[PDB]
Amino acid sequence: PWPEARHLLNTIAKSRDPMKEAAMEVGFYVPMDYSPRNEEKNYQSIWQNEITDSQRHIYELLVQSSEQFNNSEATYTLSQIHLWSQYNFPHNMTLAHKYLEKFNDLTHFTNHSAIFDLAVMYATGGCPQDSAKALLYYQRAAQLGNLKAKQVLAYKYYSGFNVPRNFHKSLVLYRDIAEQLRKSYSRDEWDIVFPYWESYNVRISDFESGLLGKGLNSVPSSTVRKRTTRDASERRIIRIYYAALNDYKGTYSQSRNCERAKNLLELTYKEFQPHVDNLDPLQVFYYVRCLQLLGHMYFTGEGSSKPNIHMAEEILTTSLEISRRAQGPIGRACIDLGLINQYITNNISQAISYYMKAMKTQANNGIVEFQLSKLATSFPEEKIGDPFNLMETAYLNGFIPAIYEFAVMIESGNSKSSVENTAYLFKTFVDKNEAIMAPKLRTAFAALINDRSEVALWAYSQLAEQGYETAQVSAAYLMYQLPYEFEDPPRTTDQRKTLAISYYTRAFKQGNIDAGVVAGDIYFQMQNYSKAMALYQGAALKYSIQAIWNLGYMHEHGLGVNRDFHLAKRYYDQVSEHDHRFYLASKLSVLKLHLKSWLWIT
């Protein structure tokens, strides 16, 4: 019956991602607490009222096929259905476990995707957690040749979580994965132009107020792109350019749509070219910016079939001519022209001149120094900077291939070639390519903005183990939030909190600060008072306001340390000294302190 099963499943379009369908022409709800009885009753109601009869027939056929015969291909499919909540079916975390276990029993440790998922489910203890079985499964899935498994093992060896600290093993694993990733790219994608994949590496709960309060948190918000923005004659070109931009680099709610931008740019160029001379005061800026954007879109070839190299060159040199007078910007135009005449045409000196004019611009990230270093390596008689220095500046700026090239270069020669710096470089590369190792962030966000919340928690828990800090703090926020004042605390089970604490702690040790304060609050609610002050002090040494004030509050009460009012006043004067706007609260707290002291009457 499985052939008929596949033929039927061919017509349901597994998962709809509103980030993509909203590109033809807000936020989400997160929950606060959890209860298994409510969830299973919701599951029963969904199966009772929503599902259509054809889907009933399909699911019954699937159960019969995967139960009667050891089909080994209906089990996997039904497990994926119940796990990623595809084909309009609801989420179950125990039955997916059952079916993945059956599949692993069948295929005798030959399939590594199911082994990876099972190791995750055995390490997070969703279903008790047992680290040894999960580690064995990680090893096994690393042997078979999975990348993410090698990455999670390398990270687990690099941070000291769950195993002792060790830098050489992490170095070896990171070198292996960096080599594979370098060999997974073509020559044109590496040398000429890097592909543009939309990143969803943001942490959730930055669209909302924030973590541990607004205007109170230390680490700045990380939402790099969300709807950039800034009377009849003037505003038209502004609106048209901003529509072009907002449809070139897609946003979070709506992904990119490039053909629209191509049409719009060619239309506005053909319409505005005859009479450009009248737009001197301000509009020449935005017009030449649009012109450069369209030239770049032609040179790369996005939104079209193939690149138009010669037309792009003419368009860009026209843009640069228009820019010469009225002193417009030359960044992207010079960058692209240099990229062209160095490889497409065989005149190198012009490319050198272009790059040298482009180095000091703001628009470049790392391309200029990268090409300069490669050429200087190929032609030592140019007298153009120093290869190590150029690759160094490139790596520092943030260009991806430069990270790997600089790691290789610093490993080839001493130049402070310790194990820590090299491990850090390779980890930076592996983490920051993000196009193969972290594709599940897209899926997580998609499933999250269509009311399926648990599957988002699952995807984020899967991405936590690899070391993607933002995914860690996101899964944490979805498992436990900070409750508003004078309100009952959440009602989540104990395992939920004891996992959220680990995720918070690893997020903190990764570099984030606010996770320290929030984990301290989790312990404070859990009535520990012992391991809380530890994190509190560890964060206070990094100058956190709420951390310091809360440490004061902890001291001046009977919990933990015993009633040392002096150190309390010390910490309150500290929080008043470091930052300003907390003046009133510091003073009022010292006043309460004085009042307690005097009420001496007894």
């Binding site: 541990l212 309060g213 607004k214 205007g215 109170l216 900070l482 409750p483 508003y484 004042e485 004078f486 306001i545 709420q546 004030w549 809360n550 706007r581 907390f582 009133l584 609260a585 009022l588 707290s589």
Partner: protein, 280 residues
């Protein structure tokens, strides 16, 4: 004083302010996590102004009760006087406030309201002394304890302003910072409270004059001469301090106003000096 409709208006004002502040506090609380955030929310503009209104109301009520305790009840002449004299001083104090911007917004208001209350106290004190002189009762000698009560009022206000000025001079001396405008602010406080102290000194010497007059008159030149002499003495001290302080600061307006009214007071002092020459 207080008309009936004014009293009901004030009761309405009090209850409205209390309700507004309670609502604002509960609002800024229920939408916050920790004390720091609700503080940053109370400091917000609307809630800031509402809390400042509450503070002003409670401070006026506190000062009213303090007055009722200290000076009992005021005579109608005193109330007419104070109601007449308030506005010019209120404008002068607002002008002192407008000298410094957002940096010194609140502490200036603190010291200004303190100065206002102390000036009201000094004026009602002078009027009470003048009443005591009119209402003198020669049935008994001016016993040590009656002068003791009056001088209790005097030394109360004396030690108050003296503590204030000495603490302010100490704050000036310890704060040799780049924040020179704070030193100028403290100098304004010194000018005001020292003016009050010199007024108290004037009143002290005049009441000792009357005490010695009663002393000799019961036991055993015109007093007008000595009264006017003390007047000139205290006005001269005023002028000297005003010069010696405001010339360093080179104030555009307080300097000119103060010294102009001081030279007019010196015109009056020269006329009284001619009275003395006629009484010589």
């Amino acid at each position: 004083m207080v008309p009936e409709n004014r009293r009901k208006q004030l009761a309405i004002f009090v209850v409205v302010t209390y309700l507004l502040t309670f609502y604002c506090v509960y609002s800024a609380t229920k939408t916050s996590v920790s004390f720091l955030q609700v503080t940053l929310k109370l400091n917000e503009g609307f809630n800031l102004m509402v809390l400042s209104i509450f503070i002003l109301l409670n401070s006026t009520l506190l000062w009213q009760l303090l007055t009722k305790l200290l000076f009992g009840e005021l005579r109608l002449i005193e109330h007419e006087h104070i109601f007449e004299r308030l506005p010019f001083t209120i404008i002068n104090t607002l002008f002192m406030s407008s000298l410094f911007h957002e940096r010194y917004f609140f502490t200036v208001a603190f010291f200004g309201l303190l100065l206002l209350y102390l000036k009201v106290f000094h004026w009602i004190l002078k009027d009470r002394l003048e009443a005591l002189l009119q209402s003198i009762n020669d049935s008994t000698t001016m016993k040590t304890l009656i002068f003791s009560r009056f001088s209790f009022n005097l030394v109360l206000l004396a030690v108050v302003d003296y503590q204030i000025i000495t603490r302010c001079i100490s704050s000036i001396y310890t704060n040799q910072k780049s924040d020179i405008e704070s030193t100028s602010l403290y100098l304004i406080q010194v000018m005001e409270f020292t003016m009050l102290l010199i007024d108290l000194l004037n009143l002290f010497l005049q009441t000792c004059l009357n005490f010695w007059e009663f002393y000799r008159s019961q036991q055993s030149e015109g007093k007008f001469m000595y009264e006017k002499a003390i007047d000139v003495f205290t006005r001269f001290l005023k002028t000297a301090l005003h010069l010696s302080m405001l010339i360093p600061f080179r104030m555009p307006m307080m300097l000119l106003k103060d010294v102009v009214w001081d030279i007019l007071a010196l015109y009056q002092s020269g006329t009284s000096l001619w009275k003395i020459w006629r009484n010589n």
